[PDB]
Amino acid sequence: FVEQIPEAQEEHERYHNNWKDLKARFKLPTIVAKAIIEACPKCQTNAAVGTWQMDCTHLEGQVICVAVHVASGYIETKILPRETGRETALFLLQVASRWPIEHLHTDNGPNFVSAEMQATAWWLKIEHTTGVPPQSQGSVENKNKQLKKTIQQIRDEVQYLSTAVAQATFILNFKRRGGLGDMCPAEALINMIYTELQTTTLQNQIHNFSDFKVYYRKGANPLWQGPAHLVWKGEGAVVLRTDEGEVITVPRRKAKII
Amino acid sequence: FVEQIPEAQEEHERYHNNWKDLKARFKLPTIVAKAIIEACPKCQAAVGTWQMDCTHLEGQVICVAVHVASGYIETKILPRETGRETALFLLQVASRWPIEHLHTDNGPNFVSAEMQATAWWLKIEHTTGVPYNPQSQGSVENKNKQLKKTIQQIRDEVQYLSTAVAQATFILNFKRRGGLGDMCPAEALINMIYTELQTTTLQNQIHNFSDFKVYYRKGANPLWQGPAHLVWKGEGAVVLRTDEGEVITVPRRKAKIIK
Amino acid sequence: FVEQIPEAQEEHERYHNNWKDLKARFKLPTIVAKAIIEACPKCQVTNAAVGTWQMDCTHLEGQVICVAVHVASGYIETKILPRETGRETALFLLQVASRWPIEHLHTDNGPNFVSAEMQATAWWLKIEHTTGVPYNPQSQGSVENKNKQLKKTIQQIRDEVQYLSTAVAQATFILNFKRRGGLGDMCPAEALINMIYTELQTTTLQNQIHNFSDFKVYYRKGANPLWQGPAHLVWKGEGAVVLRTDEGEVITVPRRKAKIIKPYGQ
Amino acid sequence: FVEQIPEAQEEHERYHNNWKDLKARFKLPTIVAKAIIEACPKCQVQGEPKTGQTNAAVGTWQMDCTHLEGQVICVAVHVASGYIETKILPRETGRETALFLLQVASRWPIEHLHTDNGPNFVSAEMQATAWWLKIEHTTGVQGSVENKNKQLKKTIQQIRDEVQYLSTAVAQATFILNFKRRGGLGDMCPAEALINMIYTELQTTTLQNQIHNFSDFKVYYRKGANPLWQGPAHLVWKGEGAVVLRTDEGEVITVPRRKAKIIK
Amino acid sequence: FVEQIPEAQEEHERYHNNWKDLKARFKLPTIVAKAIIEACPKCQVQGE
Amino acid sequence: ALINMIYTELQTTTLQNQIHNFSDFKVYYRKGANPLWQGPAHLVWKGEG
RNA sequence: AAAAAAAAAAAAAAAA
RNA sequence: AAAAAAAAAAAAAAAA
RNA sequence: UUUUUUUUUUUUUUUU
RNA sequence: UUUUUUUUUUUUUUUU
Ligand SMILES: [Zn+2]
Ligand SMILES: [Zn+2]
Ligand SMILES: [Zn+2]
Ligand SMILES: [Zn+2]
Ligand SMILES: [Zn+2]
């Protein structure tokens, strides 16, 4: 793939592809594709993976707290013995310990603005905002209505309400598909989390070790060329960008790093 | 699928799946899935689902139709936001790819008589308002945002807006790869269409089973049992449903059909 | 099959199909299908590459109709050009290339097919624009037949449709989806989809191989509790996995003794 | 990295992090991170993990019930990665265990279980829940769940002073163990490891299902002692010592080179 | 002869007729007349 | 005829191997889709499959 | 000896 | 290259 | 006894 | 982890 790099660069300069297509059309590895993408002046946390909305509902005289991911359709439900701030804080702590979370959108209820919730948010380093935000609220209410309908559908076949709530949550999470790629809500969340983690790791790796200066020998030319910014340093080869924007790969034996 | 009919039914007893999910997982015909869901007292992403919406840019109206299950998009610059133009765009889209379901918001142009006439002519199940499917509620908005983002990268080296729109659509459809399979939208759409074509060719449809009565011999009981509705007539065996709500596949030698 | 006789007739009221399509859809015999076709007053009775397309222009009722025809299958696309100019033809070519893979365009030597706009558009998509008499007369004959059939269908449909564009779109829909073709008894759209899917088999295999070259697997061999690896993954099964170690050995490991990880690094 | 030392110290003082986590988070060298963790009254630098037991599957979980401060704590541990799910049961009864299993199975894919012969693990509620979720249940004769319980107890003791109630302490300990504690086999926390395993399983299944009816270089093979040739079958891998084949029926078979013929 | 199919069916359900007679009267082809007699619960295709 | 019958019986008995000694061992079985244990029922034949 | 096309014979499944 | 004998490795089923 | 789907055989013609 | 039945591989020896 040594000679494929100029072709990939010209292809991106023409069509503006993404790295997952460059790494599959020219068979070049992942980090080389990321470096090619990030060398483009136009292409170069999304705050959409860790946004959750919490609400409380009444059913049969009991209180059910539902936390819904804004993206996809993942939900988590718990029957609260008492509508108090301590139980809400405990449920938020459990949700945070189960899945990553960064933001939280709750209403102006007395329990959501209590001191315990603020203490939990401060301990967990969570930005919590209460009030009127957009159109995702409609989807949240739609999810709540769907949960209520599923609860009513199979209520008669069980004795306790907690078992019915758990069954409804399982049905809504793992047994209902639809959307892009035909993925249930329990797989879309995992897909977004994995893609975000991969992007963050690659960006950190590329942009951390970037202040180095590497002199390289290209081809049979014995003269030392450069200086060029170090992109990726490996066991056998290193990829770097020259001041002209060209990204190339040079073996360690032909590269000197300062 | 003799051994698949009972087990699939068991699924509907526990999680209460849908008939589409039954076809997707158990590769069963639509008629038997409909019989299964109908038999349950509680109960009373496809290859042909599209979502159409409009947007404004530089004083020009752009209409975008998006396939929810793959991400394929099609764009057209409408001279005016009228019912006739949108109906013509829908007719043009339906003449290239198979359309069996169209969903759109409650805008005035989507409610006009021209759209209804076109949908009736093309035999399309057109719905408006809140999407019945829980998911796919924001795919079109994300696609519109992506198109608006990519059009700016190309607008600089382009004279006319229509050329920029066409280039952006080409780039989005062919030059970008998705996740969980690593397929661009066009390849995924073509694969889904091919699979559906093979399945429908195998099915051959044309059932017209009506309300033919069936008498069946179950187990070792010699006496006739029933009468029961007819669900599927096959050369090797026949699938039937009883008035109680049980779906049973029996060999032809122990089935008598009365019209 | 008499019960299908009425309904099929109703279909011929809307879409003017041929006897082949009715026979293939409603399972009617050939003679009765031909009789149904004849009963309508307004009715009578190549091996190119996958990415081969042709373009043509026609004049009808003071309007310019641009037709792009697939050569191998017969799938067609039509547009109403406002004014016959190189810019409009280039825009139509760009629009067609944004839906289907185009690799070779055959046109005539007209004035609007040689303008700088057409050359720029063909260079942007990296396609070979050939102008002149086609090498195979069969392709030209098929294109002319497609144009004549489009004109006939437009004439048949125009009586029930007010505007010209709607009639052209309906004729295109009928030609692409309703009337069947020759070998295989498939519609032009179905044949095009099948050909494109068949052509796209090697690329998916190469992509799968390249992606599988990324996963790592840690395996346990024998009764030794210490884990081993990392090794390249060859195949993953429901019961056991097949791996290729760095030394070249091929090892089958039960599923309970194998753990597959795709690292975030590299 | 002089400016990162106070931030790392504050973060460790809030939740006690592993030395590997501090090394891989603030990019500090090993020596300074080890000095930071070592200079803590209730922290050690042991860093001696053990093997991943013997049954390591994606859909295999475990269960246990421990007693602490006169309360019953139910713990479920993912064997392959090390994920921990904890709950406080009002009573050590079968119904509570069934409810907890139903709650756990509603979040992550479960296809197996490994419990002991306790009275609550053989109740009719357990059988009904297992039948409803299509979960295979085994009982009888481990080390992983005991180690996780010991670590959870140690973390609870570490964080018990600050909090007032016990449920909050258990939740905080679970949060610390799941996320803010780096581990081996790729240097990732258990939650990230579990997500990675699930995603790679899904991707492998999808990619394998993408190609099922076409390949290159169909080959003929001889199976067992039967000298009759068989095939043709799709070629998956061609090697110097042996070849890996996939037949039309979906079976994968390894065949020595002397028993395979390649055609083009 | 498509318009004569309902009349032939009505005549057949009034009194049952042989397929040869139906073919001779309404000038239907053999296959369609055989189909008409075919769709009768109390008729056969012996023709002996 | 006697030799043929003896040979067939010898093959059948070699396949059987006898030596059952099943005694009154009790069995709990899961029949159909019912998850609850049913029985108890006497053991008749213990086979690998 | 292998491939393709046309005609003829028999058998199995299905409707009458 | 085929048959026979001895030793070694892995997997499936069964009892603990 | 008639008609559709599948399978197994015979004859003729065109190439290798 | 130990023991029986079956299957798949490696090494050595004796013949063809
Ligand atoms: Zn770019
Ligand atoms: Zn139901
Ligand atoms: Zn007609
Ligand atoms: Zn500490
Ligand atoms: Zn009659």
Question: Can you tell me about this structure?
Answer:
This is part of a larger assembly, with six copies of chain A. With 258 residues, chain A is an alpha+beta fold. Helices cover 42% and strands 22% of the residues of chain A. In chain A, the strands form two sheets. In chain A, strands 3-2-1-4-5 form a five-stranded mixed sheet, with helices on both faces. A five-stranded antiparallel sheet of chain A has the order 9-8-7-6-10. The longest helix of chain A has 24 residues, at 185-208. Chain A is elongated. The two termini of chain A are 27 Å apart. Chains in contact: A-B, A-C, A-D, B-C, B-D, C-D, C-E, D-F. The C-D interface holds C 201-202, 204-205, 208, 211-212, 215, 218, 220, 225-227, 233-237, 240, 242, 244, 248-250, 252, 255-264 and D 51-52, 54-57, 60, 80, 185-186, 188, 193, 196-197, 199-201, 203-205, 207-208, 210-211, 214-216, 236-237, 239-242, 244, 246, 252, 254. The complex binds zinc ion (ZN) (5 copies). The site of one zinc ion has 5 residues of chain E, from loops. One zinc ion is lined by residues 12, 16, 40, 42-43 of chain E. Chain E binds four RNA strands through α3. Chain C: Residues 215-263 bind DNA. Chain C: Residues 3-44, 215-263 form the Integrase-type domain. Chain C: Residues 140-167 form a coiled coil. Chain C: This is Pol protein.
